[PDB]
Design a protein around this ligand. Structure first.
Ligand SMILES: [Fe+2]
Ligand SMILES: [Fe+2]
Ligand SMILES: [Fe+2]
Ligand SMILES: [Fe+2]
Lengths: 295, 296
């Protein structure tokens, strides 16, 4: 009887998913792509990076620990809160299934950074990197800005925040292993980062597509409001990311190229949402060597 | 000012990144490793090799198969997109939250597997009728809504009891069929998919039940008694409903009595996963050897 009330408030039949009928073809395409790309960090021999790691400066090692812990924080949030927050607003049952894959793969991504750390770093290094992630104002601000939308009640805003996280927020951290890879350092770790990017690229394209489908149902007036909100939010995350990037890379001296990479990915994120870039292309000229290391 | 400022000002604790170098409950790592190491997709099993025994099967056997499988699909659809997801907020550890994201995804894989089996063996009219039967069947909608009522409620421990009864008991009236058929070298590739599904469900039920046990042992003496009463009462309510579902699916075929013994067998296993003694005397759980041998 305790559940009688619920049965009375939910009278429509509960549906089982049928994959023999796909209302939106992109849901099957993405499900197949993402599941076809399943991987676990154990598949990559990060151990072969220890000589490279041991030749990295104390400073190089520190920046690496910090960027990876900030990426870990973002995957933790996207896996346990972000992807899950999109379920209620799904247009199809297949899309709900895709989000369960995205949630799990985000957990795989987050664990990957620990695999890298348990292979290369010392316990004190790991402890200090996680403490740093808790105390860093810029990392905590970007995390809380995104969480504020996941915990809010606007479904389209959750999608914008999720796409900006997947197609923009991770990039200030992805630069480091890509830069290092193009200099033959941490090359095995970079392969893990490449598998992560292979997933995030799809996640951002997909969720951005679902945002577009959703926003297109609104009046021209409402659409301009959401576009303005999106650009305003991207501007804010970009300003916060600039500070985060300066503190991480200034010492190493890679800052200016990382900022070009930030503008490059900010535009790609907005393109995933159906919008033009925020930055003129001439302001997005990150090193082509970094771009080719991504693939 | 900013839309998000209030939120930020109300959440001063740092957001924590999962750290797999510090694991408060070693069971979370054990289960993560077992479940991820057991990853599979239905396309990796050669279901097409079952076309012959399928087309050798009787209309009664095919109908029961379609309906049993759509009923299992419905349970996996709910567990992946509603149930596992509901357990996340109450997790004791971050590693437990990660395990639940794996369970959610694998439940979606399980649900999809039945569509792979149907697309390989059945006709489109058979598939459409089975999904329509699933939406109309009172016993199936009832078991689904009873479990969903707890996932959508606000009591963490009841979500875990409901999940464990779903994973260790509610799927069994349907798993009986492929185990029986494979014992007759029929739909053997399909049975292999079912065994991969059980390999997962048995670990999910053990794990969520373990979490329930840890959580309930923390409560007052009176609350522990209330939760035990709640668990046996929900188990019996689900059992009585499952008896009706089972008779309607299996009476024509005449497998009903053996399926009911299998229900009692698994009901006890589900209760054990929650830390409780079985509800059914062992003498009432003498499932046929063929079935127990086919599971293995
Ligand atoms: Fe990720
Ligand atoms: Fe992602
Ligand atoms: Fe399942
Ligand atoms: Fe399960």
């Amino acid at each position: 009887n305790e559940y009688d009330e619920y049965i009375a408030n939910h009278t429509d039949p509960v549906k089982a998913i049928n994959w023999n009928v796909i209302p939106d073809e992109k849901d099957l395409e993405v499900w197949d792509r993402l599941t076809g790309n399943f991987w676990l960090p154990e598949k990559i021999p990060v151990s072969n990076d220890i000589q490279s790691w041991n030749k990295m400066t104390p400073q190089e090692q520190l920046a690496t620990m910090r960027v990876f812990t900030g990426l870990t924080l973002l995957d933790t949030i996207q896996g346990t809160v972000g992807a899950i927050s999109l379920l209620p607003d799904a247009e199809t049952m297949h899309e709900e299934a895709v989000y369960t894959n995205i949630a799990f793969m985000e957990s795989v991504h987050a664990k990957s950074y620990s695999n890298i750390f348990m292979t290369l770093a010392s316990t004190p290094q790991i402890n200090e990197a996680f403490r740093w992630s808790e105390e860093n104002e810029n990392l905590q601000r970007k995390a809380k800005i995104i969480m504020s939308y996941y915990n809010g009640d606007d479904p389209l805003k959750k999608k914008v925040a999720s796409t900006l996280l997947e197609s923009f927020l991770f990039y200030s951290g992805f630069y480091l292993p890509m830069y290092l890879s193009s200099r033959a350092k941490l090359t095995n770790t970079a392969d893990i980062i490449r598998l992560i990017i292979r997933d995030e690229s799809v996640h951002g394209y997909y969720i951005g597509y679902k945002y577009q489908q959703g926003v297109k149902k609104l009046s021209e007036a409402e659409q301009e409001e959401y576009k303005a909100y999106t650009f305003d939010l991207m501007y804010d995350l970009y300003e916060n990311e600039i500070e985060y990037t300066e503190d991480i890379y200034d010492d190493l001296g890679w800052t200016e190229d990382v900022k070009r990479f930030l503008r490059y990915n900010a535009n790609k994120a907005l393109n995933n949402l159906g919008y033009e870039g925020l930055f003129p292309t001439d302001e997005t000229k990150v090193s082509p060597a970094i771009l080719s290391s991504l693939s």
